[PDB]
């Protein structure tokens, strides 16, 4: 369910800086960009 | 950059339910069952899909339980599009029917629809997308995680910033050279996010989703279809296409008269003299000071006596601090309730040039009547010919108001787009302030457009001829009422180069009357920069040299003799081409055509053109390849497949002081470009009307005309001329114009008379220049009789013919 190609990821935190826990609590995927 | 926190495919969206078919198209209910992280989700929406034309698809997503803010806007056989729907998650899918290409697919991300946050996403068909003004950017927008903010803002143009105007329209190219356009009719603060998949997200802070899709298939057809909805460009007066000269710092009528004198003595054409804030009494609208400007009315009357026009700056904000009864614009505005009001119902007070100011509400019909009266009364004192409307974001020198702004959800919204200053209040008025139609929150991006509409109407009533309005702030559909200049550009090589993409972008958005301040506004120009900027700027559809208060002078007559010669040549060529430029504005006005256009609009099937934005065309036929860097004596430009004739091979007469043809297979060509030269090439197959010289259009319009005939290899060419009185209203409706087609075929040139009336009948044709004549003719005939005189150049293959003909009477010119 979190296997989305990097270029096709749509922002689930456009409103504020978010932590992994808050992101997952929203029902979203947390995967840091590699750069 | 790429988001670390992103939606899984299972993220809750809306579900489509009860899809139904209508005569117009489709209707459905959309239901969200899981709330988003934004407040005030609208859980039940109505979808309406309207199949309006074969090339226009329209859909709306609204709250069926509450009227929401909507932008005020005037209204084999098969469509080019097909539409399908995803049920869960909800999406609209639009295919191009001809090749099955997916143009729109909103299933790619969740639909968000909350009171102050709308988000709709789509796949894009390619990495090539243009539009979403106003930003300092390449014509083709970067898809590398780019956030584009639409929130009208007073800021000197710089990359990555929301600037003076907002145009929520994009044109997307498809592999093979087809294109489509998308218009989101939403005036709220918004971010548009582009990503490399490629995909786009609209993120708006209010209103509804009102979406138009234009199927093209040609880029020129997409622009025309968009302009069908927002309005075809207004027809300018002919004089408006002449040279305009302005600065901040012409501080008296004596100094302003010296500008015209100095231009005239140095043989520089000038149609329109401008003043900035200098004319006013204490920087107030509809006044003039009794020091430097005591004889302002006489100065303007004298300009008119010499065949010139006059323009001056008008700001929106009205001085509120004067003694009661001493300043009619404020006193009468107060009486009639014309101003934007605050929470207690009093005028919102900000700070602009005169000090404390109130802001007119141009959505209030009574404010329109007040503005008409103030313009008409001032015009009875000083007969100005148009209005330069500045600071109409609206610009505020303080944040919000003198009394600050209240703490509410409009001033402090749940989603703030990427605006400079990080707040909707920065450099403007309170978002929760009251206007007749809605709050400033919803109407801000329309403020400049509403002032342009009010000013257009005011000028029609005051003068009874075509209005001439130049506006800083704009919105989609602005071009129906007014033109634009790109604002406070620095006098730099970077801003000279950036002006080309920006002028092209506004032409795609239906604002063809656009230009940048020639030689730049801020800072000090150099002589070399001012020569190159005058050369390029002579191909801006709106050509004005304007200059800031603290800058060194940059009028053409203020430079060295060699620089003056180059600037004179540029102005001479523009004046010679005015009948052609006017005809291009006619095509914009009647058919939604562009005036200045990128190569990709004219040659979309040649993918090499897609990234070219440092060259421009005028219409189909004139390719301009400017030098945009210091120290350059050559330029490399792209030449699409065909023959391009050097315009230097066409004789042009001036009042004061290299390959003849490029044969291109579609390739980059290095051209000589010394300081005194700008490269201009005429496309084979085209005929251009030209007119003799003048220091004004009043003088030039009385001169004999000429044709430049660029033959194809097969000896063919086509062109046209539109002619009217240059300033009357309702010319096309009344039929008060002449329209002529020129055709070259089999060693002959003829005219075809589409319409001939008194306006145009007596136009004299005295010269015909034919490019691409391979062999010297033995004889040249005009209506069957050997001409008085002709010259043939074997080196340039140019045949130059003297004739005595009338544009409005059928002729036949022949050679062999
Ligand atoms: C709505 O706009 C009106 C103006 O149209 C605002 O009126 C301003 O109200 C402030 C007080 O809140 C006034 O300031 C006061 O001035 C007097 C002397 O002039 C001084 O003694 C007080 O200490 C204070 O500074 C201000 O004069 C007044 N402006 C005008 C032009 O009268 C009103 O506050 C606005 N309402 C909201 C809620 O923002
Ligand atoms: C989807 O529509 C159904 C049916 O609605 C009816 O038919 C339509 C053409 C229109 O004429 C409506 O006015 C009709 O009510 C909805 O289900 C009905 O819901 C109503 C009110 O809750 C109820 O009285 C009926 O018994 C239901 N009928 C059936 C056949 O189930 C349904 O709610 C609509 N869905 C959404 C999400 O709005
Ligand atoms: C529109 O976009 C949607 C979502 O990206 C596409 O649907 C997905 O397609 C993938 C890959 O084929 C499937 O494995 C998924 O199950 C689909 N997702 C959903 C939500 O259905 C869809 O293919 C696109 N439509 C078109 C016509 O291109
Ligand atoms: C118009 O040109 C005149 C003449 O060149 C300018 O007046 C001269 O300007 C210099 C300053 O650069 C003065 O020192 C000279 O005394 C002036 N000469 C004459 C003949 O009067 C004038 O400034 C120009 N005006 C504008 C508005 O450009
Ligand atoms: C623009 O120029 C202003 C005046 O500069 C002075 O006068 C001219 C004739 C030159 O000789 C110059 O070298 C002189 O210093 C400046 O006051 C102003 O700072 C300049 N603006 C910028 C942004 O550089
Ligand atoms: O210098 S400004 O901030 N830029 C505005 C405008 O953009 C300029 O064109 C104009 O000359 C100025 C004076 O009226 C305005 O003030
Ligand atoms: Cl999850
Ligand atoms: Cl949260
Ligand atoms: Cl409303
Ligand atoms: Cl690109
Ligand atoms: Cl009066
Ligand atoms: Cl109302
Ligand atoms: Cl290439
Ligand atoms: Cl290159
Ligand atoms: Cl004749």
Author numbering:
A (entry chain AAA): 81 to 115
B (entry chain AaA): 123 to 197, 204 to 785, 794 to 952
Which of the paper's sentences describe this entry?
Retaining α-glucosidases employ a conserved two-step Koshland double displacement mechanism, in which α-glucosidase substrates are hydrolyzed using two key carboxylic acid residues functioning as the catalytic nucleophile (Asp518 in GAA and Asp412 in CjAgd31B, a bacterial homologue of GAA) and catalytic acid/base (Asp616 in GAA and Asp480 in CjAgd31B). Mutations in the gene encoding for GAA can lead to enzyme deficiency which generates multiple phenotypic forms of the lysosomal storage disorder (LSD) Pompe disease (PD). Herein, we report a 1,6-epi-cyclophellitol cyclosulfamidate as a new class of reversible α-glucosidase inhibitors that displays enzyme inhibitory activity by virtue of its conformational mimicry of the substrate when bound in the Michaelis complex.
The X-ray structure of human α-glucosidase rhGAA in complex with sulfamidate 4 revealed that it binds the enzyme active site adopting a 4C1 Michaelis-type conformation in a noncovalent manner. The interactions of the cyclitol moiety of sulfamidate 4 with rhGAA are virtually identical to those observed in previous reported complex structures of rhGAA with the GAA inhibitors, acarbose, 1-deoxynojirimycin (DNJ), and N-hydroxyethyl-DNJ (NHE-DNJ),21 notably with Arg600, His674, Asp404, and the acid/base Asp616, strengthened by solvent-mediated interactions with Asp443, Asp616, Asp645, and Trp481. The endocyclic nitrogen of the sulfamidate moiety establishes a tight hydrogen-bonding interaction with the acid/base Asp616, providing a structural rational for the lack of inhibition of the methylated analogue 5 due to steric hindrance. The endocyclic nitrogen and the sulfate moieties of sulfamidate 4 overlap spatially with the nitrogen and subsite +1 aglycone atomic features, respectively, of acarvosine reported previously, reinforcing that sulfamidate 4 is a true substrate Michaelis complex mimetic for GAA. Methylated analogue 5 proved to be a much weaker inhibitor toward α-glucosidase GAA (IC50 = 485 μM) and inactive toward GANAB, suggesting that there is no room for functionalization at the endocyclic nitrogen. Cyclosulfamidate 4 proved to be a low-micromolar inhibitor of GAA (IC50 = 5.17 μM) and is 5 times more potent than NB-DNJ 2 (IC50 = 26.7 μM). Kinetic parameters determined with increasing 4-MU-α-glucoside concentrations proved that cyclosulfamidate 4 reversibly inhibits GAA with a Ki of 3.40 μM, approximately 5-fold more potent than NB-DNJ 2 (Ki 15.2 μM). Thermostability assays (TSAs) showed that α-glc-cyclosulfamidate 4 stabilizes rhGAA with a maximum shift in inflection temperature (ΔTimax) of 11.2 °C and a half maximal effective concentration (EC50) of 1.16 μM, whereas α-glc-cyclosulfamidate 6 does not prevent enzyme unfolding at increasing temperature. In conclusion, 1,6-epi-cyclophellitol cyclosulfamidate 4 is a selective reversible α-glucosidase ligand that binds through 4C1 conformational Michaelis complex mimicry.
